[PDB]
């Protein structure tokens with residue numbers, strides 16, 4: 001099965017308690033990853049609640065980073081909002 005979230009609900013997860021962001025139509029909950037991210041937590045918080053695909057690709061993440069990111073997927077962006 002697959003959980004679909006709307007942009008409206010993803011937008012609410014941008015506070016000290018929860019940080020979600022979208023990458024290639026997939027929703028990631030990075031709340032517990034903020035302090036471990038080699039690129040820092042500031043760059044993640046800034047994109048919280050929205051689509052960070054372009055910024056993510058612009059830096060050119062390694063294969064290992066992409067493989068690791070899959071563990072944080074909680075669902076996908078609702079088809080109607082794409």
Ligand code: HEM
Pocket residue numbers: 021023028030037038039040043044047052055056059060061062063064065066068069
């Ligand atoms: C999906 C979660 C993400 C994971 C698992 C992740 C993982 C990593 C890892 C392992 C690195 C080290 C270099 C590499 O392996 O490519 C890195 C660097 C970096 N990441 Fe992420 N990242 C994620 C999301 C993001 C996002 C959304 C942004 C931008 C808004 C971001 C910005 C950066 C930057 C600026 C660096 C520093 C590159 C440098 O040293 O020049 N990351 N990330």
